[PDB]
């Protein structure tokens, strides 16, 4: 199917600190392979998937040099970043960047992103056509200026449609036992009386691979997204993911709902039912 | 911009020193080269941030850091006759243009013996009265001889105030001893006048040679005075005679 | 990762749009950029052609960036004297992760200064302080002619220096020779060089 | 400015079976700033060895991070996650039900 | 791969 890079970076100010706090991790798919922490004491990029320790010193050097690089550029934003809002160098703030690419079946280019925030929330984005830039506010149009002045989207766009790509393709080569991978959900169902007279039903989805999955409940044909209780996809820890869905029925009105799992790890959708 | 420190510096085989090198605009790449005839620039290390620093292409000998955004200090631990040369510090973003902003350049001489440290001689030349009538101008020559090595810096003052149009001073010295790696070098520059400015008792001309040389903390004892950093000037008044 | 500069010396007369040239063998550069440096003096950025663009331009000078063919030309229209330095090209990585610059050695340039009414003459300037001491002046003559050293030694002879008069608008080549020999005179100072046939020599 | 107050699900690796080895997990994710404790507590005391994933975030910007810690569930002991973050006026607990 | 030229805000 298709795939995709990104890169998220976290930037926080630490007033009274002799250095911000700079984070940066890597992702293929749903699978973190790279992370690098300034608090660290190796100051390195770090593997953080075994596919990509087979990468040799030229790759972690190149890599540690630009990642601190990225540290650095960071650091300064946050002090132009308080001076486009004129705050205080008395409180924390937060700057996050995100940026990578998707690639179809054929692995070939997509779509190519590069956001970036600012105390949670938008602060300029590239638009889809990699040529121009959206500014949330005021301050961001002077971001868009500079970058406009200094033609930015156009090198960045190379690196999207170029470079990320095809690592984004050596990556998924090299590890292919892992990202070309698709784990179906281990399904099953819980049953709790919440009362004499009512009862919760919840449907369990486990060790699945990609995170994309769909639970749904219904009642004799019906949906019951209304009264349906979802949780966040979670991590189970081991590379695999976890998710749940309930509802709240009648006592002896059970066998009259059922649960619908669809993941592309699975040939066709589940459907699941209570029985006693 | 990018300002780098000293300018100009003499040190004996041995001694440590540490040129400076500071930028304020927020530039996150940093890096010094070392220039040499026929040699080209050389880049020795280099920094992409604080808490990076990488070598070069001549790194030996040579010792950085990047504690801070504005200063990436070139350290020579035991200064070598080898790391004579002109440094250059160089430093740009790691985006935008790339452009790259470089510093004045500082020149460093490394001597096994102080001894062979001479500040110039300086001395100014009259235009000839055969000038004079043949062109209606008037040209005065400055010649700083027998210094070493070579740091200096020629000035031209007239009437207590630097000119710089109608003069011309040779791009670099010449060595009086040629086939010598130590020979002391000579200086000449010309100002150039019209006959009438020349010939009027009210005008003063003074060349300057700013000379850097030795400093306090160096060992001297000699019968000769010690060589320091310092001003050497020669002069003449116009005349109509 | 390879960068030239040929041919690596150039000299033009004064007024003639002059082009210099940078070649560069990867193709994937980030800019390049084009300095101009004067001996025993540091070095100006001149101009700077970013990877998507074509071409810079300011005042007299204007280069343009041929990313595919790995090249760059740096044109200096209306060369002056002023224009007279050694000029550096150099670029820098899109990729790679290193940062590092790739300079080439450079194209040492010369713009001989046009004069007007040539007056090749040689005078004997002596001391301000001790008319015991002189030093000879050949100045005046045209670009055609070269300065060489002497063939002596202790007979110090400096290279053709152009100075400018500019309320004046007028300009003028000179050297300078000087000698504690004995047998050193104005008459021969300048014996080892080509010298134009009618230079004055006042008595 | 923006502060979410972070999302807590407390649940194992594995299906919970007594005497075996698993692993105890505490998802935090929603919240923002990035600042946040948490902690995994045995029968109401602090579990020793506790790490965490590293820092990142989700489409809408809000941060999520994975505690675990190896352990062996048993019927009697009773496990929880303590989180303290700027939205909350109290650190808030949430306990280990492996019934649901 | 990260990308190598990051221009700041």
Not at chain 3, 88 to 107: E, K
Request: proline share 5%; with cysteine.
């Amino acid at each position: 199917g298709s795939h995709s890079m990104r890169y998220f970076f976290t930037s926080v100010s630490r007033p009274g600190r002799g250095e911000p706090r700079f984070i940066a991790v890597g992702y293929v798919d749903d699978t973190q392979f790279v992370r690098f922490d300034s608090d660290a004491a190796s100051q390195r990029m770090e593997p953080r998937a075994p596919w990509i320790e087979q990468e040799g010193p030229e790759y972690w050097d190149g890599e540690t040099r630009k990642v601190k690089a990225h540290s650095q550029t960071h650091r300064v934003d946050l002090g132009t970043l308080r001076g486009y809002y004129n705050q205080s160098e008395a409180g924390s703030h937060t700057v996050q960047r995100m940026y990578g690419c998707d690639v179809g079946s054929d692995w070939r280019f997509l779509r190519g992103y590069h956001q970036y925030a600012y105390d949670g929330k938008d602060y300029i984005a590239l638009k889809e056509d990699l040529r121009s830039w959206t500014a949330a506010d005021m301050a961001a149009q002077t971001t868009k200026h500079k970058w406009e002045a200094a033609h930015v989207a156009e090198q960045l766009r190379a690196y999207l449609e170029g470079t990320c790509v095809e690592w984004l393709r050596r990556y998924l080569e090299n590890g292919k036992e892992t990202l070309q991978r698709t784990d179906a959900p281990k399904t099953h169902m819980t049953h709790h009386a919440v009362s004499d007279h009512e009862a919760t039903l919840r449907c369990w989805a486990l060790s699945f691979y990609p995170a994309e999955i769909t639970l749904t409940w219904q009642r004799d044909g019906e949906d019951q997204t209304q009264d349906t209780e979802l949780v966040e996809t979670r991590p189970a820890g081991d590379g695999t993911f976890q998710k749940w869905a309930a509802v709240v029925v009648p006592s002896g009105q059970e066998q009259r709902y059922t649960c619908h799992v669809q993941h592309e790890g699975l040939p066709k959708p589940l459907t699941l039912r209570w029985e006693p | 911009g990018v300002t780098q420190t000293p300018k100009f510096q003499v040190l004996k085989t041995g001694q440590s020193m540490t040129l400076q090198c500071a930028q304020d605009m927020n530039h996150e790449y940093m890096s010094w080269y070392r220039q040499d005839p026929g040699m080209g620039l050389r880049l020795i290390h280099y920094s992409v941030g604080a808490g990076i620093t990488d070598q070069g292409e001549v790194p030996n000998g040579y010792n950085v850091s990047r504690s801070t955004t504005e200063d990436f200090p070139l350290r020579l631990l035991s200064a070598a006759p080898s790391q004579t040369s002109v440094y250059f510090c160089a430093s740009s973003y790691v985006g935008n243009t790339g452009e790259l902003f470089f510093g004045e350049g500082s020149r460093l001489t490394v001597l096994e013996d102080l001894k062979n440290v001479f500040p110039p001689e300086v001395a100014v030349f009259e235009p000839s009265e055969a000038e004079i009538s043949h062109t209606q101008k008037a040209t005065l020559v400055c010649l700083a001889t027998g210094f070493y090595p070579d740091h200096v810096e020629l000035s031209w003052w007239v009437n207590g105030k630097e000119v710089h149009s109608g003069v011309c001073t040779d791009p670099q010295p010449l060595k009086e001893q040629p086939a010598l790696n130590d020979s002391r070098y000579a200086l000449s520059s010309r100002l150039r006048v019209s006959a009438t400015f020349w010939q009027d008792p009210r005008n003063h001309f003074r060349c300057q040679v700013q000379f850097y040389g030795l400093s306090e903390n160096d060992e001297w004892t000699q019968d000769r005075a010690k060589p320091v950093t310092q001003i050497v000037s020669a002069e003449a008044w116009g005349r109509a005679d | 990762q390879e960068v030239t500069q040929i041919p690596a010396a150039l000299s033009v007369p004064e007024g003639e749009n002059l082009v210099l040239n940078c070649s560069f063998t990867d193709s994937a550069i980030y800019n390049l950029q084009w300095f101009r440096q004067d001996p025993g003096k540091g070095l100006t950025s001149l101009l700077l052609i970013q990877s998507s663009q074509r071409e810079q331009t300011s005042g007299r000078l204007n280069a343009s960036l041929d990313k595919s063919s790995g090249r760059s030309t740096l044109y200096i229209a209306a060369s002056q004297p002023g224009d007279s330095a050694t000029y550096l090209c150099a670029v820098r990585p899109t990729s790679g992760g290193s940062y590092i610059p790739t300079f080439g050695r450079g194209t040492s340039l010369i713009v001989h200064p046009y004069i007007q009414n040539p007056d090749p003459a040689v005078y004997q300037l002596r001391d301000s302080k001790s008319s015991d001491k002189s030093v000879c002046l050949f100045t005046d003559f045209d670009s055609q002619t070269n300065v060489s050293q002497s063939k002596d030694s202790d007979v110090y002879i400096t290279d053709k220096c152009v100075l400018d008069m500019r309320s004046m608008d007028f300009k003028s080549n000179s050297a300078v020779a000087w000698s504690n020999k004995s047998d050193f005179a104005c008459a021969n100072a300048f014996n080892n060089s080509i010298i134009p046939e009618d230079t004055f020599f006042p008595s | 400015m923006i502060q979410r107050t972070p999302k807590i699900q407390v649940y194992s690796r594995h299906p919970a079976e007594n005497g075996k080895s698993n692993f105890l997990n505490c998802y935090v994710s929603g919240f923002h700033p990035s600042d946040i404790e948490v902690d995994l507590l045995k029968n109401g005391e602090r579990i020793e060895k506790v790490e965490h994933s590293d820092l990142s975030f989700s489409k809408d910007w809000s941060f999520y991070l994975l505690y675990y810690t190896e352990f062996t569930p048993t019927e009697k002991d009773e496990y929880a996650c303590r989180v303290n973050h700027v939205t909350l006026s109290q650190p808030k607990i949430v306990k280990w039900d492996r019934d649901m | 791969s990260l990308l190598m030229w990051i221009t700041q805000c």
